[model samples]
Target: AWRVIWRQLISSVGSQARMLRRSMLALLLAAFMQGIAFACLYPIIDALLRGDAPQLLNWAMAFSVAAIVTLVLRWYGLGFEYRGHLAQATHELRLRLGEQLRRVPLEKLQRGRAGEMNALLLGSVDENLNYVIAIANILLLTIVTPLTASLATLWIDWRLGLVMLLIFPLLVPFYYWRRPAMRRQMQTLGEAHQRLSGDIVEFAQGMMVLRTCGSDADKSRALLAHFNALENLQTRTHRQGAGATMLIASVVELGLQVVVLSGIVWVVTGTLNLAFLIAAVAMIMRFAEPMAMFISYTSVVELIASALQRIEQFMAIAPLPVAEQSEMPERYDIRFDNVSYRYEEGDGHALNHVSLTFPAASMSALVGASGAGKTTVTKLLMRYADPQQGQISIGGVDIRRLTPEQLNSLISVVFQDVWLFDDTLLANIRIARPQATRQEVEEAARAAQCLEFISRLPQGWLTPMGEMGGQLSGGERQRISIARALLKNAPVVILDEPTAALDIESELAVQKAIDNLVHNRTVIIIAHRLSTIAGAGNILVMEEGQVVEQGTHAQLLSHHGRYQALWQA
Candidate 1:
């Protein structure tokens, strides 16, 4: 575990490797110099107590110079250089995470794990970086100070130095014993923390429903239960850790007492003098100081280890594959050849052996009952997910060979559920074409029939859309979404039941907007209302993940097949 964590720390800050090495080297040098100055103090004080003023000024000046140099290096190296590198590393890691997220397929990205991902990105990264710096400082000081002090004492008397060295190893068992338990408790706490975050988000988002139906009781109970579990886990971990800590402290105290006794024995005999005994006592205290510091940081090591593991797990998710030599298609005609796909193999196929072609510059409509694979066709066209078996191509070129930018540039979609940011209406419309001028945006809004209602808003085109555009009616939000798609003006347009859930007036208004937006473009419309797409260039009737009928509306009706049955119903 220790080796694994060390490797993660090194790699996590690898971008700033040179700066990290420089800071660590400077810190160790400072610690070493300070130790020498401190060791000199013991002898200087002993000499003063023994009425030896000779060479006093020289010893004082030497110690003062070493102490000043230590302070200078500490300020410049650890405070400035080390912290600056960490801050820059934090920024780079955030960008890398976002870049990876952008490359991952939408299916894996929407698995309802935002709570855990946010925790790892925000909390885990911070804790791990902090631990890296802290552990470096602790290890450097803990190792250097003791070794420096013990060796100086050994030169004075070997037996006392051996005793000091042996005592520190005894403290190692406490760390090794405490680690496994600490790790177990931390894992439990981390799981509980993730649950608490997810529950809080759900509770807040559903506040309206909870209040309207007086259903707050169930949601509140669940949230409180999660909160209680987290609290209990934290309390238990702290209690257990305190007991282990006391045992560690007891070992250090026992070692200190033995050293004091040994010093007295050596002084009583003719072997050691009083001044040297005083110095031995001082050196023993210096050696034991780092032991206490080392044990205190043992718990942090486990937390950092767990945090780093979570980050590594998230980063290890493979991104969607992209081809190296992407070729742009000259046309936007779409084709699916023996395509098969399933969200999960156990649930059966969502699209099964579906072969179809949508000619360029004509509108095609897909009509089917819910879960009959009508919407799936649109999704596949956008390449949100690839087929498990065959291929989907654009202009006779397999779409899998195209880069995401190349694919997105050719298509635009107005979904059933419209999403708007909490910004000015002008800014939301401009999202489709960020470089579009104010006049051009207004033109697009007028084209989508959004200008009429937008003019009545408090700020006109500049009115803000409150969270998810909740302040606007359903029809108004749909029109704004249509306006965005119109501004993009891509070669292919996808409309997914645009007016399915609207009332009479809103439906009429939205249909007019849709008619204006689909002109002279290759469009695929997923229709739930049969009357909406009666004049479409072609209609495909789908059932059970297969296209069972295709032709003009009148042609399908003449056959008296599923299209006729659906139209009558």
Candidate 2:
């Protein structure tokens, strides 16, 4: 655990270091200006205490004025630099996280997949912003405050400055020594926090199911137990961190008390004037802020360490290689040649040595048993994942060679699991073609059979579709999805069980709309029912990831192979 903590810190420091480089010139100027401003204050305090001659008083007032001017300006500059650096750091973290999410094998993601972990991508990235902000605000001031205060003390009386400097050195080591324990405690604390967050998300999403099963009572009780567990861990970490901070604060406070008493003794002996004694005490307080925050920095070290570890973990995994496309094909001709893919080794391949072609400008159907890889082929064509072996081509060119953006431009997908934003119905349909006017969107809806039902709605296309389009019936949602695909006007379209969730009445209408839309376009559809297969240019029957047989409806019914068996069964 200690090793993990330390490793995380080192990684965070690396990210901070990168941020520093972009803003280094401005940061250095601010640090120097602040240092000069703070350092000029020593004589002003000393002179006021001594009631020094008029000439000296004049100089002190001028110094005070100059100090205020620089300090105010420099602090503002610090704020500016801090926000700029934080923005860059967060951008880098998120960009890398999205990239990693794509390359991580699906099996690994599914195993650890949870809302809590997904939330980390957003929240943990923001946490790094705090670290960056604090580092900027504290780092420059930490150096400027202490060094300026020390130099002022030395100039007034070297003897006093030497003693004070000696004391401060010892405090630095004591404060930093508190780090190891704080870091380990924080790591434990963070894990507990993630666990608690995960539980809350699960509870909320499953609330309906749990209530129906009478499991809600048990889960609610368990939630309190989990809450208490998290509280205990948080309490322990907070208590320990606070205790460590108090130790350093107490030492600094106590040391000042002792040093002032010594100054009083010297003043009485006439070896130190009142002016010198007063100035020394003031400088000591000036130096204490940095020492205090430096100690508190130990807590920051812990957070930054954790943030960095996650950031680094994401960066270490190579993102899926960018797809390269030489050219966009003039027509869509999708072909699969012995392509086999599995989520991981030993697990069954989602697709196994299956090969077929959807003729250009034609509609084709893939009908299969439950595990028939119909959806798998759709995913592969969309470039969600690459095959372990063999090739897939559109227009006689391997799709693997195309960039994601390029492939996306050429194809559109409408899955059984439809996704729609919680917005007006017009917006959902126009999502694929954002620039389309309301007239254009209504036109597409008409073609997809959505206009009829939509016109009956109180607000027509302006009606709010609830989350995931829950406000719409199954067939209505399917029609909207079809409208979205038709709006894109892409050459190749794939639909996975498009009408599987619809009732018989709406199913036939949606099927007709789909048939009309696919004319003169390459369409590959995963058809679960016989109605869809009757219209296809060709049909492929799949069983257990393999293509058992394929033929036209008449040819297959006559031969009575796997297709015939499935028909009879």
Candidate 3:
């Protein structure tokens, strides 16, 4: 168990490795000091009983110095948190998670994959180090200090020392017995925590729909049942653990009594001196409490074990690789050269030897039925994943060689579902170009026709957004999204049928907003409604994983091919 803990500790601590190492070393020394201090009791008590004044004074000083050293070392060791190195480590942990979340592919990630990760990172980080140093400190003192004192006792009297050794080995079998059960319980508890958190997030996200359907009662009742099961399992874990620890303590307590009885018998039989027997009794009582405490801290160890495993699993997901020498593209033209891709877990190919191109500032539309690779085309261009067979390039530069920050700065996407953060209205628009001034933001908003809505807001541009902030119609939200894209001013824009869910009035409003956003930019539109993209410079009709036809709207219609058939439909 000790080996499992330290191995994981060394593996998971990244930037904080040196600090953790120093603190653990300090804790080890502190445990040694505490044990030595307890060892001094034998000499001090024996000298006092024999009425040897000088010897008693010497041993008392040794005990005092050892005790003082233990105190100083403990403060230094636990100060990894209090004196404040560990806090910075945990803060870095969260910051890195946020950075990774930003870089992960957005297609699948858009559907709340990030939220599930957010909960895991938040919960597991707390489990990892919230009580980690303190637990390690306590565990060391309980295990190391007693064993240290036990070895010291051998110098005083071999029988008592051997007896102490026997007690430790007895607890070992019990640990092996309960250890497997405790691990299983911890696994179930972690799963329950994950389930409860995910369901609660989903429940809250869909609360309005649930309430509208009047199924709030049923869903909430399910949540109630889940919460109850978690509670019952937690209680059982605690109760069972409590029983184990108490049993462990009792065994130690009984063993210590036997040691005392043996010492007393030895003294009476003239095999042991009165002073040594008295010292032995005094020290055995002190050992009882920490021995019991050592058994109790195992649960905390198990919690950290689970946390480390979670952290390892998360960290193993490698982000898209950046080239050693990444550079920005000077031209905005886009190309796909025989790009073929199948999702990691998806069946067949999503894109199969499909190839296409868009001029620097030309407007192109991808149109087809569901699963015809329209969405896949745009997603691939967005760099969701590398194609298995070919290359995607912008201005003759491979996208795989572009840095994440540079790639993000190059393109802006407006999805069907617009996500508004819980922040100030001004902040929401500014999120697009974080460096944009307030005046610049308003200019972009005006261009996207957001000023009229802003004027109606109670606090104007400073008004808050999201659940409690303000309510917006589908069109209003799309305009807000357009304002973001306009502010971003990327060289390329991808629109994912942004107005499909809006009413006609909303669609017109959003179309106008989009008109202002796509100005002088490379544009790719994924359209389900054929009418919307009829005026596109180029139309690509895809079927299955390939484009069956490509031409101007009139040109394709004249061909009487797939595009003509779709137009008539």
Candidate 4:
């Protein structure tokens, strides 16, 4: 079904637009009801000020108290409902955003505006919700405030009320002045915040590289430059908003003073009753509150509209065709027939036309230098990205036809980058096999030589490993990652520099675990240390993006080709 982007925006704003159509049909029902209650007191206030009847004041005070309590209760209920709706919307929207991210290709994610994406996901969405709240306020003020004030003025004197109505339209000109500037300022604020955030994140991700190259000072200078630029843009945005605010404030004040002065003159000339004159002036003064509210709501309104645009724009991005129709293989061998890949449309090729065959349940090893497409193959196998030209099949079914979850289930990866959720060791390890028992966890850990470390921990299997396995050493984390892979027990296992960050002691322990896990599966090991895959059934050597050599390690060495040359060096 084709989803209309605007309709999606309404739901995305948490308006429950369809459900609330009747609320609008109710013609600002609560606001109108609230207006009636407020307007009812206007004449009574006028009467009290004009005639000092202390006995009658008691009855008026009682009536006012009753209205106050009832209105206050309604105000509380309205807020509670609004917040409840917003909370539900936030949860659903966040989940939808995450789900969209999962379906989107890294190519698109990489292309996405940086800090902006983060801001949209984290800050922008919240800003939109704030706008929703403001919108509700706008709705209330536009309906209830004006209606009550106008009725109050009319009840006192229809003639002055008509004049006030004529003057109120004058405020419309100020709204016209602010609206365009408000929209532009809000958009600028959203964009500026996103750019600033992206730069900060990029710097953080590249911190290690910068430190090693002794480029920290240079990077710091660049970051400061970016920050200074963002600050200047923010200053401009704030200035524009302040200018709009000043215009609206000045107009509202001028309108009120004019109305008050006009009413006073009518009273002095005996053209308007003294009580009506006082009531008219008070109502006009109150009018400014709503006028101010109306101006503020415009800012919130634009904020929400801009956020909606970014979110819908992202959701509109044709997510990679992972959900399309295709024949998924039931049982078959994996084959890559002339596959090629690259990061960008015009960028250097990351993989050349490469053909390979892997018989079901067989083992293979891919070896090469840092820039070689070893990890790229693993990524393709995992369907992280589809090849530009080629067909990859599993059991005679195209891998591209398979769902991401289906493809992910077909393989397990134990990479050098070990990411452990901030959780208990047991919970983290069991992520691969949620139903696994404590005994099973321990068995996998023991197999991976990780049980020794867990045993040393104060809580054993229950030990809390902090974010990214900070509580554990490199080897320990790798071993735990291996333990997770073993627990997953998928048919295909890809190990990319599994022990690259480890020292001898941890590497040996991790290697043993890797060895045990590769027993019956079709293993594709991308290892830096030749000793690890010395006994492999086959080896594929990649350069630039093409496989320059292949066969047993001995044959490659005999050929004295790139593999042997690299190995000997």
Query: Top lDDT: which candidate number?
Result: 3
lDDT of 3: 0.76
Candidate 3: segments with Cα more than 4 A from true spot: 1-19, 48-54, 98-120, 169-177, 185-246, 261-270, 273-278, 291-296, 316-318, 324-327, 417-420, 435-439, 466-470, 554-569
* lDDT scores in order: 0.74, 0.69, 0.76, 0.69
lDDT of 3 at 553: 90
Q: Could you give candidate 4's per-residue lDDT for residues 297-360 as a string of tens digits?
A: 6656555655666677767765447546455565647788999887656766878888876665
lDDT of 1 by residue, 32-142 (tens): 777777667666766777677776677788889988998787666667444567778666766766776677676655533674576446544563556566676666776
Q: Compared with the true structure, what per-residue lDDT tens digits does model 2 show for residues 25-79?
A: 4555655555555555556666665667785678766767766665665555565
Can you write out model 3's per-residue Cα lDDT over 371-439, one digit (the tens) per residue? 447888777777787788898998879898897678878898888544666788787888888889988
TM-score of each: 0.81, 0.74, 0.82, 0.75
By lDDT, the candidates rank as: 3, 1, 2, 4
Q: Pick the candidate with the highest TM-score.
A: 3
Clashes of 2: 1
